[PDB]
Amino acid sequence: GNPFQANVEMKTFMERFNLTHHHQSGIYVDLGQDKEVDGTLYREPAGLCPIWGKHIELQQPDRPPYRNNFLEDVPTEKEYKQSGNPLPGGFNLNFVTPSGQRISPFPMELLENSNIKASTDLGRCAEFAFKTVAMDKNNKATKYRYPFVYDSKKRLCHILYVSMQLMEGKKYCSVKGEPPDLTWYCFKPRKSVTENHHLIYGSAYVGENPDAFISKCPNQALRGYRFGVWKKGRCLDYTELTDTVIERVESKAQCWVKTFENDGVASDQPHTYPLTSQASWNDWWPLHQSDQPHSGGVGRNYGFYYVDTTGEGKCALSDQVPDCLVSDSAAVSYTAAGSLSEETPNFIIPSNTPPTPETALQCTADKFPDSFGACDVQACKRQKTSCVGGQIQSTSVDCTADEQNEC
Numbered sequence: 001g002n003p004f005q006a007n008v009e010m011k012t013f014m015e016r017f018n019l020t021h022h023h024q025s026g027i028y029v030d031l032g033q034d035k036e037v038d039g040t041l042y043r044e045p046a047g048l049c050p051i052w053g054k055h056i057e058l059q060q061p062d063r064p065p066y067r068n069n070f071l072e073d074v075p076t077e078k079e080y081k082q083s084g085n086p087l088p089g090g091f092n093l094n095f096v097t098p099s100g101q102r103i104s105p106f107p108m109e110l111l112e113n114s115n116i117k118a119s120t121d122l123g124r125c126a127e128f129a130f131k132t133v134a135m136d137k138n139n140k141a142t143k144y145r146y147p148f149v150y151d152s153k154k155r156l157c158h159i160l161y162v163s164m165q166l167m168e169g170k171k172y173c174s175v176k177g178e179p180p181d182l183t184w185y186c187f188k189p190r191k192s193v194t195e196n197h198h199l200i201y202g203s204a205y206v207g208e209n210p211d212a213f214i215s216k217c218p219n220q221a222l223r224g225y226r227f228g229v230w231k232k233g234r235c236l237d238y239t240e241l242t243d244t245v246i247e248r249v250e251s252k253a254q255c256w257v258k259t260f261e262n263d264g265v266a267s268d269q270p271h272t273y274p275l276t277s278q279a280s281w282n283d284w285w286p287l288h289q290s291d292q293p294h295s296g297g298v299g300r301n302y303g304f305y306y307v308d309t310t311g312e313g314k315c316a317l318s319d320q321v322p323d324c325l326v327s328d329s330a331a332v333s334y335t336a337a338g339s340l341s342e343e344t345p346n347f348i349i350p351s352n353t354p355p356t357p358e359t360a361l362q363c364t365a366d367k368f369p370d371s372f373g374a375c376d377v378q379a380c381k382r383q384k385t386s387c388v389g390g391q392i393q394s395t396s397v398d399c400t401a402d403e404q405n406e407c
């Protein structure tokens with residue numbers, strides 16, 4: 001009797017944390033699909049959940065004309081003639097309509113318009129991205145869809161022409177202008193303990209069903225609980241699992257960053273990039289490669305900050321999809337997909353469309369009596385499930401004096 005499985009409301013709550021199920025693609029680098037454009041096969045971001053706080057850190061020279069900001073416009077041919085190597089600018093789609101209307105960034109007020117069906121601001125930007133496709137050379141609508149960033153502060157929706165997310169090595173690219181002959185600067189995905197929390201990155205496919213992310217993706221940190229897996233008749237938090245990575249942290253936010261940046265996070269990036277005959281890297285989109293990985297969202301995406309009995313702040317990282325929780329008011333559970341904050345921001349609350357509940361961890365002492373599992377005689381602990389201040393509690397406690405003879 002895992003209560004988190006036996007209770008269908010608690011079960012459906014825990015499902016939001018399964019990134020392999022809903023997101024289904026890379027998170028650190030998302031390149032989960034393939035689409036041909038003008039006779040060439042390109043990798044395309046495909047994941048269904050927004051990645052909160054994800055930004056691409058660029059490594060352009062530290063001088064004019066370089067902004068080191070992936071939200072800047074992709075450069076014009078002239079701009080690049082003027083700058084020298086490497087390319088200046090950013091990843092932002094710079095196209096104009098025949099009318100001369102700019103496509104990105106696009107303001108949320110203009111979206112909130114009946115061609116846009118999403119009920120939340122973040123969903124409206126995802127839906128905009130989903131309704132925006134590469135046009136081929138000739139000029140026809142293609143199936144390749146650009147990823148987006150919602151800058152939730154400025155309320156602006158960015159369609160990124162550049163769908164590349166990681167490029168490293170003097171093979172392909174320069175770091176702060178060294179070596180100088182290379183066309184591309186290097187870049188990589190980051191989250192920061194302090195910056196760009198108000199930026200949300202996503203594949204266009206978050207917009208295909210633009211309200212689904214609200215209730216199927218783990219958007220927000222989970223305060224007051226530690227991710228766990230049901231074993232031996234009780235909830236074992238990640239600290240009790242053999243394959244967990246445990247690192248010391250100074251702060252809870254560093255743990256949140258580590259769930260995205262650790263070496264085992266779900267990533268669709270190949271270890272060597274494609275064999276071309278170009279001098280170096282020379283495309284706006286990643287090329288299809290026979291041996292490309294598709295993580296399908298599987299990876300060390302999960303973790304929690306907690307304080308050990310020694311008083312040290314630590315971060316437990318796991319690839320194990322959680323199917324239970326251990327309650328701990330000081331703990332916070334994070335994923336590679338969600339935000340640092342545990343509070344639901346305004347811009348994923350229907351602007352109109354009732355808010356979907358998560359009432360699954362609410363309880364009453366009356367209807368939810370103290371319940372004890374059987375003693376795990378290996379650890380000599382047993383599950384205790386109960387209700388305190390209207391919140392479900394789940395911990396491992398001492399076995400009865402009698403059961404201890406069997407440990």
Ligand SMILES: *[C@@H]1O[C@H](CO)[C@@H](O)[C@H](O)[C@H]1NC(C)=O
Pocket residue numbers: 018019020021321322323
């Ligand atoms: C997570 O989702 C994937 C794909 O649907 C599934 O294979 C896996 O069992 C799920 N894990 C759970 C519920 O622990």
